[PDB]
Write a protein that binds this ligand. Structure first.
Ligand SMILES: NC(=O)c1ccc[n+]([C@@H]2O[C@H](COP(=O)([O-])OP(=O)(O)OC[C@H]3O[C@@H](n4cnc5c(N)ncnc54)[C@H](O)[C@@H]3O)[C@@H](O)[C@H]2O)c1
Ligand SMILES: NC(=O)c1ccc[n+]([C@@H]2O[C@H](COP(=O)([O-])OP(=O)(O)OC[C@H]3O[C@@H](n4cnc5c(N)ncnc54)[C@H](O)[C@@H]3O)[C@@H](O)[C@H]2O)c1
Lengths: 394, 383
């Protein structure tokens, strides 16, 4: 009903006037390359499967405008391995996005992390006026994570003021979330800051700002990761993830009663292990952190890459047809917010991010909340959440 | 292979990312005629599953005077004549795509003008839309190409046009561009026969009066109507100029030895297979396409074949399609919609001569007439 498959090219349908222009776009990529998961080399897949071209695969029609979802013809490791090439393929996708009407384009996933948070792109297109404006969307993502912290505490039957909160990954998203959480939600009793060893001095400065600028009066701890998080992180009762490295947290070692909000993509813990533990014990709550729930249903048009349409053609793989029609990622929705509300300026670079409050406030005014607790394909059943709340609430 | 490049990826996609430049003009074509015997699938299966009811940008012709996109409508020719409303609808969808990729003018090739009131049904449906490119039938440039082919086929056959008995088969939009232009630019022939269907008799009689009282033709004029196939009187002509919208109305096996045949009809008004077979055995006719131009420079062609559907002379370009480029580069060459007068046709002829264009080398569809066999014809039947 709210999800429709389109076998014909969206680009073709647009150029003949059969579908209207969009107001915004969001750029994504084709996950990660693993030679043991595909029949072909990385170069073969880029040239012959992705055709070295951006691919317009989805339209999300919201109450606040239409967003095109456009996949770059790259894997995430390609973006990190040659920034010049990443910027060039992004500029190619921006030209397509402008033709189909986008005024603002969000850089989803790890594209900001790989492109100096967009600054490498804006420098390369400074001599052009024919392209949409770019945004990392991280202020909206930060607002979505804070909404999810609020939601997961409510669903768990606990107040944030009694939690010991562990932040795993204090990069662009993580440092949007932490100040906004302190500004908008009750302060927890303890905060642990966890990142890699080379960022010790960076974390020490955050600790100073926590005391003197954000007004945090609780206990502050620093925890340095090597290949995985240190064991002290498992003393936390609420874990907030935003890493660029998968599987650094062992979900089987979190204590019963722990709440986990994770914006990392791929997740900083094993999704399959989390689902298994939850189904067997119902003693954690865990969720994506970046997903918003719109008050109005969203109409999604899906055009699969004809390769994927045939191989990933399980009749049950049409879980797309049944994905929640109220959900939209905050990063992608940020491009619509910047076009609806001029004060929500696009973000490029590491930004001061106190304007994250403006994103949180406008989402609250529009009656957005965090998406219902879920992790990738798996929705946590409401009765199982109630069982957790009965046992581990306060 | 230096001038024809095959592209595996969508030209539309390549354009939208800036990998290929915009075009200056476009030309709309269609997928020929649907033969149920030859084809394996059905008509609706190919329209909905193979063409996807979408126009298909299949070629780019890079010339010394700009780039033209060749765009195939998702229809067969019989679909255009039977349903003018649907034809105009898919044409307007193709025009929107053509505008996006840069085309300022769009030629309506083949039988598209004949099936759409020569473009008037299109201009009526676009109404007050001000974003689409301008359409042209291109028939003034087609007419110039035919006159250039008449000149060339008499050059190579060793024949003088002033002594020929010329028979025109089909006096529609193209035919009535060719006839006045031939008289204006070439030596007047000895005799002209006008042949069209029975119901256009009064129309042909009016042409006859214009030949004597407007165009100053002093030779013999004869009218010969068709009921189905052409009348026997047409085979008395030594030069036959064809421009019909019906195939196989002229029997190539009944033309007299030494006959020259210039045919712009598509499909041709005679059997091409029988024409090639007779030429190789007897070498007693010269026959050629009439609408094909020869550029002085080789044209680079990019070809993107439609996947489900999936040796040209690099100097050759059809006059109809090239007309869209001419209108985009020369403001004085106005586009043609409807049945227009033939005064401006000399402008197209003079510009093509100025650009060192001539008619394509004698050929019919895929078959090229070997220059040695042309010399033999000039030996046996060349005045
Ligand atoms: N789905 C979306 O559209 C979307 C939008 C925004 C962010 N994200 C996801 O959020 C996550 C963070 O994005 P970002 O721009 O802030 O990236 P970032 O590169 O700026 O920050 C990542 C942080 O993770 C830290 N980290 C790496 N290994 C670690 C370990 N073993 N222990 C603790 N910390 C470690 C890094 O040192 C770094 O500080 C990414 O996975 C990204 O894909 C997804
Ligand atoms: N390849 C190209 O791009 C291109 C461009 C222009 C014209 N053409 C071809 O030229 C031909 C004519 O085009 P047009 O716009 O002038 O079409 P038209 O409909 O205006 O004229 C066709 C004429 O042929 C006549 N005719 C039909 N049956 C006849 C018969 N049995 N005997 C004598 N005359 C007969 C019609 O009555 C009609 O007057 C078409 O086949 C068309 O496809 C091709």
């Amino acid at each position: 009903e709210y999800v429709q498959f389109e076998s014909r090219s969206l680009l073709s349908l647009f150029t003949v006037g059969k579908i209207p222009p969009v107001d915004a776009a969001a750029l994504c990529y084709w996950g990660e390359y693993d030679p043991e998961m595909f029949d072909w080399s990385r170069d073969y897949m880029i040239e012959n499967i992705f055709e070295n071209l951006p691919f317009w695969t989805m339209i999300k029609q919201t109450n606040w405008g239409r967003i095109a979802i456009i996949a770059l013809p790259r894997f995430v490791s390609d973006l990190y391995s040659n920034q010049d090439d990443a910027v060039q393929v992004i500029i190619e996708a921006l030209e397509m996005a402008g033709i189909i009407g986008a005024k603002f384009v969000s850089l989803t996933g790890l594209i900001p992390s790989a492109t100096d948070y967009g600054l490498a792109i804006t420098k390369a297109v400074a001599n052009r006026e024919d392209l949409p404006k770019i945004t990392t969307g991280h202020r909206t993502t930060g607002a979505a994570v804070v909404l999810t912290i609020k939601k997961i505490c409510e669903q768990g039957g606990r107040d944030l003021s009694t939690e010991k909160v562990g932040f795993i990954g204090l990069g662009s998203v993580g440092m949007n979330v932490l100040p906004l959480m302190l500004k908008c939600l009750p302060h927890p009793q303890e905060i642990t800051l966890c990142d890699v060893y080379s960022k010790l001095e960076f974390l020490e400065n955050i600790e100073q700002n926590l005391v003197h600028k954000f007004g945090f009066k609780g206990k502050i701890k620093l925890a340095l990761s090597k290949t995985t998080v240190p064991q002290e992180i498992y003393d936390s009762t609420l874990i907030v993830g935003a890493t660029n490295v998968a599987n650094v947290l062992d979900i089987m070692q979190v204590k019963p009663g722990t709440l986990i909000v994770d914006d990392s993509g791929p997740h900083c813990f094993s999704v399959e292990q989390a689902i298994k533990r939850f189904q067997e014990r119902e003693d954690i709550l865990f969720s994506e952190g970046g997903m918003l729930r719109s008050p109005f249903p969203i109409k999604t048009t899906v055009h699969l890459l004809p390769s994927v349409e045939k191989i990933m053609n399980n009749a049950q793989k049409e879980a797309v047809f049944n994905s929640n029609p109220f959900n939209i990622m905050g990063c992608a929705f940020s491009a619509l917010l910047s076009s609806q509300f001029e004060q929500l300026e696009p973000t490029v670079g590491i930004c001061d991010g106190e304007q994250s409050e403006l994103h949180y406030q406008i989402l609250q005014e529009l009656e957005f909340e965090a998406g219902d607790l879920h992790c990738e394909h798996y929705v946590l059943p409401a009765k199982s959440i109630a069982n957790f709340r009965q046992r581990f609430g306060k």
